[PDB]
Design an enzyme around this catalytic site. Structure first.
Site, short mmCIF file in Angstrom:
data_model
loop_
_atom_site.label_atom_id
_atom_site.label_comp_id
_atom_site.label_asym_id
_atom_site.label_seq_id
_atom_site.Cartn_x
_atom_site.Cartn_y
_atom_site.Cartn_z
CG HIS B 40 -15.45 -7.49 77.00
ND1 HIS B 40 -14.27 -7.72 76.33
CD2 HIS B 40 -15.40 -6.23 77.45
CE1 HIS B 40 -13.53 -6.62 76.38
NE2 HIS B 40 -14.21 -5.69 77.03
CG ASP B 84 -13.98 -10.77 74.45
OD1 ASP B 84 -15.21 -10.52 74.29
OD2 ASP B 84 -13.19 -9.94 74.99
N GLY B 175 -11.68 0.96 77.22
CA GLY B 175 -12.21 1.78 76.13
C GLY B 175 -11.72 1.42 74.75
CB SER B 177 -12.76 -3.68 75.09
OG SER B 177 -11.88 -4.09 76.16
N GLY B 178 -12.72 -4.41 71.90
CA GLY B 178 -13.47 -4.60 70.71
C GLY B 178 -12.79 -4.11 69.47
#
Ligand SMILES: [Ca+2]
Lengths: 4, 223
Positions: B40, B84, B175, B177-178
């Site tokens: 994402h 994801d 913020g 995410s990942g």
């Protein structure tokens, strides 16, 4: 629900 | 990160910031040329920032390297967030040192109750917004699959797990995410999604990295  | 603490400069040496003129996502360095992040987070124009602590000030130890490939999992679903996960290849190899270091991939999946370290430069408020300068950290356990499905009925796939706290106040947030979920020195999760952040009964949801170890290896070997 939501992406972070 | 809501309800966490300041990690300390370069104490999470595998944490990267993905930057497009601003910090927009985290990621994890897995070798000198490749970063794991969330599908994402994909966009054009990614610069990977390694060795960061204060993302607003050049302090020393930073390496800025453009992404040369950004490979979203082919089965990523943008509506359910299944699969994801993304791999980013760096245009040049990072110089590895004590402050810029890879994190190992899992050799098996982690169990409920395993304590992990989750980190990022995301929002630090459960209501409203505040973005930190420095990297924040949170220790959080992996939840049981039953508890995860009770919190998110119909929304948890085999490629997801929940981690955190049902009482509220401690979670990853926008913020983050990942970025990494590391447990006993292995990258077991990627910050993915949740219902708000740090809300009661709504833990964070994370991509289950152990399901992708063979996919990551094959993808790197072919690129
Ligand atoms: Ca900096």
């Amino acid at each position: 629900a939501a992406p972070x | 990160i809501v309800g966490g603490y300041t990690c300390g400069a370069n104490t999470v040496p595998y944490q990267v910031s993905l930057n497009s003129g601003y910090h927009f996502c985290g990621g994890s360095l897995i070798n000198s040329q490749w970063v794991v992040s969330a599908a994402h987070c994909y966009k054009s124009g990614i610069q990977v920032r390694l060795g960061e602590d204060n993302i607003n000030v050049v302090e020393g130890n930073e390496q800025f390297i453009s992404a040369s490939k950004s490979i979203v999992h082919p089965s990523y679903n943008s509506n359910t967030l299944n699969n994801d996960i993304m791999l980013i290849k760096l245009k040049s190899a990072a110089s590895l040192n004590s402050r810029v270091a890879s994190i190992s991939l899992p050799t098996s999946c982690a169990s409920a109750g395993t304590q992990c370290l989750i980190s990022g430069w995301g929002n630090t408020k459960s209501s409203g917004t505040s973005y930190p300068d420095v990297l924040k950290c949170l220790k959080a356990p992996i939840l049981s699959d039953s508890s995860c499905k009770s919190a998110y009925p119909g929304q948890i796939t085999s490629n997801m797990f929940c981690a955190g706290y049902l009482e509220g106040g401690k979670d990853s947030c926008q913020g983050d995410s990942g970025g990494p979920v590391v447990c006993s020195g292995k990258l077991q999760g990627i910050v993915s999604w949740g219902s708000g952040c740090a809300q009661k009964n709504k833990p964070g949801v994370y991509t289950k990295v152990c399901n992708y170890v063979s996919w990551i290896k094959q993808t790197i070997a072919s690129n």
